[PDB]
Design a protein around this nucleic acid. Structure first.
Length: 401
RNA sequence: AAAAGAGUGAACGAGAGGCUCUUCCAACUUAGGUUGAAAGAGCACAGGCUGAGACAUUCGUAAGGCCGAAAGACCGGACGCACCCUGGGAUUUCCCCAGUCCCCGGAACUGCAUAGCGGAUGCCAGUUGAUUAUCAGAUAAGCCAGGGGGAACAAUCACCUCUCUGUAUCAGAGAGAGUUUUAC
DNA sequence: CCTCGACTTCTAGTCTCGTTCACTCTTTT
DNA sequence: TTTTTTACTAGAAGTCGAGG
């Protein structure tokens, strides 16, 4: 039945097991010591032999659902996972980081300098200046003063420089291989090299990282790194009739390297689920409201005084056109103040226990009153009064649900 | 090889908005208040680093062409600069990285020449201690700031059986050796 | 009969356009 | 000539009881 992973006293991933009774007696015997609650690992506390039979790990690459599966040689299944990456958030978080940065460098230096210039009388006499900068053919308009040197001509990257979003995917894939190697004694590694010519979109960073992952996983398993092919995976899924399921593809990718695989049966049983939680959140501002709202009878009648970029709702300007000065003289303005996040908060991914004693993994902290989170939501979707909950462990990035 | 695809990373420049304040006008209610128009001034995660580096004007920036009466222009690429290299930093942290930036070296490489750098002149800081000196302090038109890990940190008993309560379920609590051994 | 409050319950968050540059992977041919 | 709507965290408004 269940498979209880085992680790040597020396901390060496030994073969797991499936005896159950002995895995309890041996816990009551104290001989052992839980090392993880899921997947259940038990480190022996009586140094014994550490024999470990050969195991193959089939990695099915992917940008949001990395799938892995360690299989015995006969073709038996000892582990099956389905990692859900956060690779789709990294790209957008960086676009925002850019806008934010460019704003800081426009509203806190450029303008300022342009303000201090006009004030000191140290500004272009024309007030504007077209400047054809080396590399461009169309000039750039500089108001009041010149432009901090633009650097876009010879910025060199190391060879094989991969973009933040791609690096992430790669590391992830490998970080998961390392977590699997701390529970089971992995020997060889099969990877399913994918292929998209480009001739629910994405499917791009994977094509760029597949090559680098293959190299990296060839040094992690020196002399033991094979590469299958989606096609083979399919041929297998019709040859051994593995019920088609995105998560049953890794078992197939892995069962390929196996030569005399006699006991190849679909790896039944729901596969473990791993969620990736961000490690650092250096953002401090939750919302800077940015809106001067007007309220005649306490109801918005002007979100600004004049429209803004993409502002659809009417602005005081429109109102003044529709109503009178006796009307505009009664309006009430209400601009809420910027809301800053609590940058030392138990971060989504932490492990906590409820007042009743249920252990859970923070998914999101909903609510705040008098400076105290109102509810800690679990990854299962239950809401617990934070005030009563207890902190146990911080985020680990890849966290099994 | 190009050719495209398909993502994703830089630097610099402009706006619409916004915040505060001033002046003025109008409106509306109690000299006052509220609101708006117009003009002006300042301000732009929380922060960390550093004391100056910003701006303006002017001059200087290789030989080699080649064209000019010349002056000069144009090409070129230096004994010029560099986003390039070597080293060292700031941001920077439990432990790392990215990015950006900075400081001395500049060989190759790579880039630029209306750029960049340097000089000159102008204009924009802060001065107090602890002790002429030294060590703090003060001081921006300095730089970086909304990216990625990893470690460590349990009130971590899973699975099978029985009993009890709830629960349409399922869930909760208690006890248990269930075939050895991770390999007879 | 309120009201004071422990909690529920629920909504909401900036945006666009200039002058350039980059590196990495697939495929076409 | 248009690439794709995500979602945690903060804070205001609301309800349910206390209770006196």
């Amino acid at each position: 039945m269940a498979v209880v992973y085992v680790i040597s006293k020396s901390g060496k991933p030994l073969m797991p097991t499936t005896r159950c009774g002995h895995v309890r007696i041996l816990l009551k015997e104290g001989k052992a010591r839980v090392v993880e609650r899921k997947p259940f690992t038990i480190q022996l506390t009586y140094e014994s032999a550490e024999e470990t039979q050969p195991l193959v790990l089939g990695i099915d690459p992917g940008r949001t659902n990395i799938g892995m599966s360690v299989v015995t040689e006969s073709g038996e299944s000892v582990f099956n996972a389905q990692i859900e990456t956060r690779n789709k958030d990294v790209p957008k978080l960086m676009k925002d980081r850019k806008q934010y940065r460019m704003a800081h460098r426009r509203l806190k230096r450029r303008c300022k300098r342009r303000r201090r210039a006009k004030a000191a009388g140290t500004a272009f006499e024309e007030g504007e200046k077209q400047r054809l900068l080396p590399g461009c053919f169309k000039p750039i308009t500089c108001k009041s003063i010149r432009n901090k040197e633009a650097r876009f001509n010879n910025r060199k990257r190391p060879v094989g420089w991969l973009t933040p979003t791609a690096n992430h995917l790669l590391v992830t894939h490998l970080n998961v291989v390392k977590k699997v190697q701390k529970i089971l004694p992995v020997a060889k590694v099969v990877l399913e090299l994918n292929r998209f010519s480009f001739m629910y979109h994405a499917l791009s960073v994977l094509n760029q990282i597949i090559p680098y992952l293959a190299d990296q996983l060839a040094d992690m398993f020196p002399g033991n790194f094979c590469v299958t092919s989606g096609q083979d995976t399919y041929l297998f899924r019709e040859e051994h009739g593995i019920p088609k399921d995105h998560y049953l593809d890794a078992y197939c990718i892995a069962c390929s390297a196996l030569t005399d695989a006699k006991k190849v049966s679909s790896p039944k049983g729901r596969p473990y689920m791993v969620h990736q939680f961000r490690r650092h959140d250096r953002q401090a501002c939750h919302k800077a409201n940015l809106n001067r709202s007007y309220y005649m009878g306490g109801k918005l009648v002007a979100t600004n005084r004049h429209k803004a970029m993409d502002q659809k709702t009417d602005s005081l300007e429109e109102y003044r056109a529709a109503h009178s000065a006796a009307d505009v003289s009664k309006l009430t303005v209400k601009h809420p103040s910027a809301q800053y996040k609590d940058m030392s908060r138990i971060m989504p991914g932490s492990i906590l226990v409820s007042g009743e004693g249920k252990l859970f993994t923070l998914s999101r902290s909903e609510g705040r009153n008098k400076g105290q989170v109102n509810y800690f939501v679990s990854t299962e979707g239950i809401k617990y009064w934070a005030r009563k909950c207890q902190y146990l462990r911080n985020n680990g990035g890849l966290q099994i649900y």
